Ligand SMILES: CNS(=O)(=O)c1ccccc1Cl
Ligand SMILES: CNS(=O)(=O)c1ccccc1Cl
Ligand SMILES: [Cl-]
């Protein structure tokens with residue numbers, strides 16, 4: 001407690017000694033309060049909006065640009081649950097770490113991430129200026145030697161829920177735990193259940209492969225506030241990755257887990273305006289990319305235990321018998337890898353095809369681990385899916401699409417209002433017309449490679465690419481990102497969907513976009529197309545006028561028409 005978190009608080013208290021007041025009317029119940037001291041909207045992308053006029057009247061799209069679960073506690077699991085988790089976590093770190101060696105990530109790797117503008121969750125006005133200043137690295141090394149001493153001084157979170165930190169503390173986490181993402185621990189090759197690095201164009205093929213396994217329904221239960229339901233027992237099972245480490249790495253990693261995760265300190269603004277300095281032991285508080293890997297790990301653990309419950313491996317969560325323990329251990333060594341293969345897990349998001357539908361009502365371990373299901377009553381059996389093309393995963397569903405030549409594409413899809421509404425939004429200040437145009441181009445190229453099968457998005461993508469100068473490079477201030485490039489989109493399409501695609505045996509290239517199919521006209525409408533509306537027909541007819549409006553605003557530049565690629569603009 002105060003041994004570990006004190007110095008961090010005491011250092012903050014000193015710097016605001018003239019304004020340090022113990023607020024007696026503090027709203028916290030489950031967070032520990034310590035003291036208080038005196039102390040960013042969505043912006044519309046104009047290029048994308050001018051080329052999507054029909055959507056200017058559609059509520060869902062328009063309203064996307066307009067505009068307390070942290071203060072809950074999580075009961076400690078029973079003895080049987082805690083034993084199931086410890087055994088499963090032990091086994092899972094071994095299976096993951098069999099083909100992978102834990103290592104420290106380097107200043108040089110970290111600096112490359114800041115120079116390439118990667119999201120680290122920092123709070124020198126820029127990351128670039130800090131990694132170039134040798135002073136900072138002296139601050140880092142001071143904390144570093146404090147961590148080797150088993151102590152902490154400057155690793156405090158800043159809730160604004162994304163918890164930001166000073167770049168230093170971010171480096172110390174990346175140095176100790178970055179290997180999990182940097183070395184692809186949660187790849188489908190190393191993990192069997194994971195999809196890390198897969199890409200949207202892979203995920204449908206993966207869920208079709210899971211479908212092929214004999215068993216029951218596909219389950220895709222969402223957890224009600226996953227990050228808030230991470231227990232101290234969860235954090236202790238995650239910490240066992242240090243059992244596979246040695247030297248400066250093992251001790252440094254041990255310090256991230258014990259000083260920053262298993263104990264924390266946070267600064268949250270309250271408008272009554274005072275900064276509160278609060279602490280707690282449990283719940284997920286770490287960088288997004290580490291949080292992704294540890295969420296995947298604990299989700300993989302939880303779903304193997306739910307599978308064990310459905311299969312009758314153990315009878316009660318109250319207490320595991322020594323005989324139950326060896327059976328659990330034997331199930332893992334015998335069938336564990338096959339069971340991990342029956343799942344697709346992306347952080348808190350899962351799809352599970354269990355051995356049979358007993359899984360649907362195997363709820364005692366899942367509820368006792370704190371992973372309570374969203375939108376369903378505590379003890380009501382899960383609703384399963386009887387077709388892989390209906391299963392929700394990573395905010396998508398997936399269609400099976402037949403090319404005129406008989407080859408099979410499995411494509412990603414979601415309601416089209418969501419896609420158009422997101423592409424119309426840009427975050428942050430000081431965007432030039434050129435910067436705004438290059439972000440619109442990034443969305444257009446993504447639609448050409450991921451959503452080419454939606455009539456409205458292939459047309460709007462061709463319009464935006466025709467309105468932005470051909471040689472201007474697509475941008476994104478903040479999954480694979482193959483659409484990010486200046487190469488021909490047809491060349492990239494052929495690479496992604498034909499050349500690289502392990503599910504496509506015939507490698508015969510496509511030589512025209514008209515060889516690339518759409519969903520059925522009725523299916524397109526079901527997934528939110530405006531085909532059949534008068535607004536959409538006038539937009540399609542008159543698209544060159546919209547393109548020319550945006551060209552006139554950007555000015556005299558090198559422009560390439562990409563509308564002739566489509567049959568209806570081809571003479
Ligand atoms: C607007 N005409 S359409 O797109 O061909 C169509 C879509 C869905 C159901 C019936 C029809 Cl006719
Ligand atoms: C050529 N345009 S379109 O997207 O094929 C279409 C537009 C309006 C109604 C139905 C359809 Cl299919
Ligand atoms: Cl279904």
Ligand SMILES: [Zn+2]
Pocket residue numbers: 143147151152153154155169259
């Ligand atoms: Zn620290």
Ligand SMILES: [Zn+2]
Pocket residue numbers: 397399413414415527
């Ligand atoms: Zn769809």
